[PDB]
């Protein structure tokens, strides 16, 4: 979950 959370944060 946390790996994915970070991957998506990179959107910003």
PDB file of N, CA, C and O in Angstrom:
ATOM      1  N   UNK A   1       0.792  -1.208   0.000  1.00  0.00           N
ATOM      2  CA  UNK A   1       0.000   0.000   0.000  1.00  0.00           C
ATOM      3  C   UNK A   1       0.837   1.276   0.000  1.00  0.00           C
ATOM      4  O   UNK A   1       0.578   2.258  -0.694  1.00  0.00           O
ATOM      5  N   UNK A   2       1.855   1.281   0.850  1.00  0.00           N
ATOM      6  CA  UNK A   2       2.671   2.488   1.019  1.00  0.00           C
ATOM      7  C   UNK A   2       3.561   2.763  -0.199  1.00  0.00           C
ATOM      8  O   UNK A   2       3.790   3.923  -0.546  1.00  0.00           O
ATOM      9  N   UNK A   3       4.043   1.713  -0.855  1.00  0.00           N
ATOM     10  CA  UNK A   3       4.826   1.839  -2.077  1.00  0.00           C
ATOM     11  C   UNK A   3       3.995   2.552  -3.166  1.00  0.00           C
ATOM     12  O   UNK A   3       4.415   3.473  -3.874  1.00  0.00           O
ATOM     13  N   UNK A   4       2.747   2.105  -3.276  1.00  0.00           N
ATOM     14  CA  UNK A   4       1.833   2.631  -4.280  1.00  0.00           C
ATOM     15  C   UNK A   4       1.479   4.088  -3.950  1.00  0.00           C
ATOM     16  O   UNK A   4       1.420   4.943  -4.839  1.00  0.00           O
ATOM     17  N   UNK A   5       1.213   4.361  -2.675  1.00  0.00           N
ATOM     18  CA  UNK A   5       0.915   5.703  -2.192  1.00  0.00           C
ATOM     19  C   UNK A   5       1.974   6.695  -2.708  1.00  0.00           C
ATOM     20  O   UNK A   5       1.693   7.758  -3.244  1.00  0.00           O
ATOM     21  N   UNK A   6       3.239   6.305  -2.558  1.00  0.00           N
ATOM     22  CA  UNK A   6       4.379   7.134  -2.992  1.00  0.00           C
ATOM     23  C   UNK A   6       4.490   7.274  -4.517  1.00  0.00           C
ATOM     24  O   UNK A   6       4.720   8.378  -5.024  1.00  0.00           O
ATOM     25  N   UNK A   7       4.364   6.165  -5.238  1.00  0.00           N
ATOM     26  CA  UNK A   7       4.334   6.186  -6.682  1.00  0.00           C
ATOM     27  C   UNK A   7       3.335   7.220  -7.213  1.00  0.00           C
ATOM     28  O   UNK A   7       3.584   7.984  -8.143  1.00  0.00           O
ATOM     29  N   UNK A   8       2.165   7.236  -6.595  1.00  0.00           N
ATOM     30  CA  UNK A   8       1.128   8.146  -7.046  1.00  0.00           C
ATOM     31  C   UNK A   8       1.433   9.588  -6.647  1.00  0.00           C
ATOM     32  O   UNK A   8       1.150  10.496  -7.410  1.00  0.00           O
ATOM     33  N   UNK A   9       1.989   9.798  -5.460  1.00  0.00           N
ATOM     34  CA  UNK A   9       2.371  11.123  -5.007  1.00  0.00           C
ATOM     35  C   UNK A   9       3.282  11.838  -6.015  1.00  0.00           C
ATOM     36  O   UNK A   9       3.281  13.058  -6.165  1.00  0.00           O
ATOM     37  N   UNK A  10       4.073  11.034  -6.723  1.00  0.00           N
ATOM     38  CA  UNK A  10       4.975  11.552  -7.731  1.00  0.00           C
ATOM     39  C   UNK A  10       4.257  12.317  -8.835  1.00  0.00           C
ATOM     40  O   UNK A  10       4.868  13.160  -9.505  1.00  0.00           O
ATOM     41  N   UNK A  11       2.964  12.064  -9.001  1.00  0.00           N
ATOM     42  CA  UNK A  11       2.139  12.852  -9.894  1.00  0.00           C
ATOM     43  C   UNK A  11       2.350  14.357  -9.723  1.00  0.00           C
ATOM     44  O   UNK A  11       2.260  15.153 -10.647  1.00  0.00           O
ATOM     45  N   UNK A  12       2.606  14.743  -8.472  1.00  0.00           N
ATOM     46  CA  UNK A  12       2.684  16.149  -8.101  1.00  0.00           C
ATOM     47  C   UNK A  12       4.048  16.791  -8.332  1.00  0.00           C
ATOM     48  O   UNK A  12       4.219  18.005  -8.190  1.00  0.00           O
TER      49      UNK A  12
END
